[PDB]
Ligand binder design. Structure first.
Ligand SMILES: *[C@@H]1O[C@H](CO)[C@@H](O)[C@H](O)[C@H]1NC(C)=O
Ligand SMILES: *[C@@H]1O[C@H](CO)[C@@H](O)[C@H](O)[C@H]1NC(C)=O
Ligand SMILES: *[C@@H]1O[C@H](CO)[C@@H](O)[C@H](O)[C@H]1NC(C)=O
Ligand SMILES: [Cl-]
Length: 418
């Protein structure tokens, strides 16, 4: 349970086998109320058939608890697995074709808002005297009319272009197999979604044959359909008391910067925080590259009016240290810290060093102090362990350096370790 042990044995010490190319045939379902940027509160129910065809449900909701369905998208098409990604090691690229996008509204208020918005976005879509009514499926992608209005909901299915299936087993055994389908991540800027080729992953979907059995959401979503959306349990929101230590549960993938694990320490006495960011080149986080240590201060919590269930925080980084973890990294840091700004840093593999030099010249152009506007939430897993979520990093590689760039979605959770 110690933070170091949990960072050495990610995901409860489970062993993963990745079959490349993956087998995606089956019914894949969400494990909870997912948050896409927006915010968009949703769950997924994806069927991939042996005919390389697909039926995907996207159930949307009005709240972070996924208890009041608003509208549901039924997406049909075909998928074609291509070659293994060279951008994201462990991922397989795929190509897809959409063949239909249907929408069903679940309340009369949503039926009215959506029909009006689609008509505003695509002036001719709707006939003169016929507003949408609830519980009726409506074609948003009318194919053979060459007229579509997926732009009204800023819809894109590019998540299907990056695919990874992990077979997870607790202990070195072939028992209690959980199959997880990772699909491409969703851009944090909804306008850029139709242009975004995924470079990381959404939260994993679980297989209907090989799912965690304590996952109540999984069963609710398995048995759902477009007319009976999954009603998730009305769990109460927990109050964020940023305290203790937290570590990554998985080897996380971030766009362009490769793979990583995190260790956070919060000091509720003086509202100070520390973070370790262990960077790796491999999708199993066994081949390290460099490590970053950050320390600073954080503000008090304010409940968000933009993301239900979120608590807004302001974080300030005052001090930062870097540890090279391979010869290439130490060499690069030595070449730049010396041949340009500064004189000597003697970067060494495994040796931590501050990036603010005594003369105040920071290496690689880092700007300290740095302020980030964060969003946090705390949940519990099926074993009751607390989980800490912070804001999804902006997809372009930018930092949430202004309040208007604060995330409306979250990263993969950290789990409490002390
Ligand atoms: C593919 O065959 C499956 C049965 O394996 C069927 O359910 C599905 O309708 C077919 N393709 C389409 C249109 O999704
Ligand atoms: C919009 O919808 C109304 C009501 O359904 C309909 O009368 C009208 O023709 C539509 N057209 C435009 C341009 O919005
Ligand atoms: C805050 O308190 C912690 C002890 O919990 C201590 O390690 C740290 O140095 C303190 N920071 C400041 C700025 O006082
Ligand atoms: Cl972070």
């Amino acid at each position: 349970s110690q933070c170091h042990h949990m960072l050495k044995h990610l995901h409860n010490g489970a062993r993963i086998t990745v079959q490349m190319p993956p087998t995606i045939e089956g019914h894949w379902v969400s494990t909870g109320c997912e948050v896409r940027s927006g915010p968009e509160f949703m769950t997924r129910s994806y069927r991939f058939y042996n005919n390389n065809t697909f039926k995907a449900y996207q159930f949307y909701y009005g709240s972070n608890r996924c208890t009041n369905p608003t509208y549901t998208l039924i997406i049909r098409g075909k998928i074609r697995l291509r070659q293994a990604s060279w951008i994201i090691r462990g991922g397989t690229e795929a190509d897809y074709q959409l063949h239909g996008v249907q929408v069903i509204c679940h309340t009369e208020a949503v039926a009215e808002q959506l029909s009006r918005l689609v008509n505003r976005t695509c002036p001719g879509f709707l006939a003169p005297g016929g507003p949408w009514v609830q519980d009726v499926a409506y074609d948003l992608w009318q194919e053979e009319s060459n007229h579509e209005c997926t732009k009204a909901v800023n819809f894109a299915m590019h998540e299907l272009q990056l695919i990874r299936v992990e077979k997870q087993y607790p202990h070195h055994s072939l028992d209690h197999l959980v199959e997880e389908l990772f699909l491409g991540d969703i851009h944090t800027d909804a306008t850029q979604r139709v242009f975004y080729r995924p470079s990381s992953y959404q939260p994993p979907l679980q297989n209907a044959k090989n799912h965690n059995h304590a996952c109540i959401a999984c069963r609710i979503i398995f048995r759902s359909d477009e007319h009976h959306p999954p009603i998730l349990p009305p769990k109460a929101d927990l109050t964020i008391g940023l305290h203790g230590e937290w570590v990554s549960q998985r080897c996380e993938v971030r766009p362009e910067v490769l793979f990583l694990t995190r260790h956070f320490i919060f000091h509720d006495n003086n509202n100070t925080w520390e973070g370790h960011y262990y960077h790796y080149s491999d999708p199993v986080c066994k081949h390290p590259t460099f490590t970053i240590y950050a320390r600073g201060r954080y503000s008090r919590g304010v409940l968000s009016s933009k993301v239900m269930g979120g608590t807004e925080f302001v974080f300030k980084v005052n001090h930062m240290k870097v540890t090279p973890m391979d010869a290439a990294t130490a060499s690069l840091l030595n070449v730049f810290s010396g041949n340009e700004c500064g004189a000597e840093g003697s970067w060494q593999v495994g040796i931590q060093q501050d990036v603010t030099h005594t003369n105040g010249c920071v290496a690689l152009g880092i700007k300290l102090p740095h302020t980030e506007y964060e969003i946090f939430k705390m949940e519990q897993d099926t074993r009751g362990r607390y989980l800490l979520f912070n804001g999804q990093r902006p997809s372009d590689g930018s930092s949430p350096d202004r309040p208007e760039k604060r995330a409306t979605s979250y990263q993969m959770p950290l789990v409490q370790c002390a």
